[PDB]
Amino acid sequence: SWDVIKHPHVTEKAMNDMDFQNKLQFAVDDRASKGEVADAVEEQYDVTVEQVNTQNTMDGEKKAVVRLSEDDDAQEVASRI
């Protein structure tokens, strides 16, 4: 069975969303929906996801931009992992 979250997308623009807009970027499995990416991020990091924006990258993988709520901080999540 396939896993949703593969690995985090850690690029310079992935920081411009982490610092400024409180968003965590992951490169997920292409068969996953915005609702499946949402539940998956919560069940692995104990956070609260408000919005998920997807894009099908030119690498065949799916890039998921996950926005957290004010109660959780993106800069603080990227530290432990």
Binding site: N56, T57, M58, D59, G60
Partner: protein
Amino acid sequence: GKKSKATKKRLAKLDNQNSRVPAWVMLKTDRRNHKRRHWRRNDTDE
């Protein structure tokens, strides 16, 4: 032209096939990419 999901997955792989033989393979075999494609001179599928 509007590409579909699969068409994208394919054109994506073809781009990774355009990467050179890494520096270490030369040092391991003790001394050529044959699927060398150009965006102008060559033709892909579809």
